[PDB]
């Protein structure tokens, strides 16, 4: 806070180049966020800087919420999470800017 919280979306279809990650995302898809936290779009000059912050904030919040419940993410989870959140952040930027 005060961060903006976007609407829940369907978790994106992503073809990971790493075949094991690709399978892992599908197997464990519900572990990952389906909404992103961000600072308002109009505070940014470009998509890249927005997404950078959106990814950091969203990953921080999801990891914090998870750890305090006594659950864990694997190294593979984190890699997949960063990519999933990146895509949702890009979608959020393009949408909210439109
Ligand atoms: Cl979903
Ligand atoms: Na591959």
Author numbering: 126 to 223
Please share excerpts from the published article on this structure:
Pathogenesis in prion disease involves refolding of the host protein, PrP, from the monomeric, primarily α-helical cellular form (PrPC) to a β-sheet enriched, aggregated infectious form (PrPSc). Additionally we found that rabbits, a species with low susceptibility to prion disease possess PrP with a helix-capping motif in the β2−α2 loop, which appears to hamper the formation of the β-state. In the previously determined structure of wild-type rabbit PrPC 121–230, the sidechain of S174 forms a hydrogen bond with the backbone of N171 and vice versa, creating a hydrophobic staple helix cap motif. To test this hypothesis, we introduced the single mutations S170N and S174N as well as the double mutation S170N/S174N into rabbit PrPC 121–230, successively changing the rabbit sequence in the β2−α2 loop to that of wild-type hamster PrPC.
The structures of the S170N, S174N and S170N/S174N mutants of rabbit PrPC 121–230 were solved by x-ray crystallography to resolutions of 1.4 Å, 1.6 Å and 1.5 Å, respectively. The overall folds of the three rabbit PrPC 121–230 mutants (S170N, S174N and S170N/S174N) are very similar to the wild-type structure. The structure of the rabbit S170N/S174N double mutant PrPC shows the features of both mutants with N170 remaining disordered as it is in the S170N mutant and N174 no longer hydrogen bonding to N171, adding up to the same loss of helix cap-forming interactions found in the single S174N rabbit PrPC mutant. Changing residues in the β2−α2 loop in rabbit PrPC to those of hamster PrPC causes key interactions in the helix-cap to be lost. The S170N single mutation reduced the rabbit PrPC ΔG of unfolding to 5.9 kJ/mol, while the S174N change and the S170N/S174N double mutant displayed ΔGs of 5.45 and 5.7 kJ/mol, respectively. Introduction of the single mutations S170N and S174N and the double mutation S170N/S174N into rabbit PrP each cause respective increases in the β-state propensity of PrP. At pH 5.0, no β-state forms in the S170N mutant, whereas the S174N rabbit PrP begins to form the β-state to a maximum of 12.6% and the S170N/S174N double mutant forms a maximum of 37%. At pH 4.5, the S170N and S174N single mutants form 54% and 66.6% β-state and the double mutant sees a larger increase to 84.9% β-state. Similar to hamster PrP, both the wild-type and S170N/S174N rabbit PrP convert to primarily β-sheet secondary structure immediately after dilution to 10 µm PrP in 4 M urea. In contrast to what had been seen with wild-type and mutant hamster PrP, rates and extent of β-octamer formation did not differ for wild-type and S170N/S174N rabbit PrP.
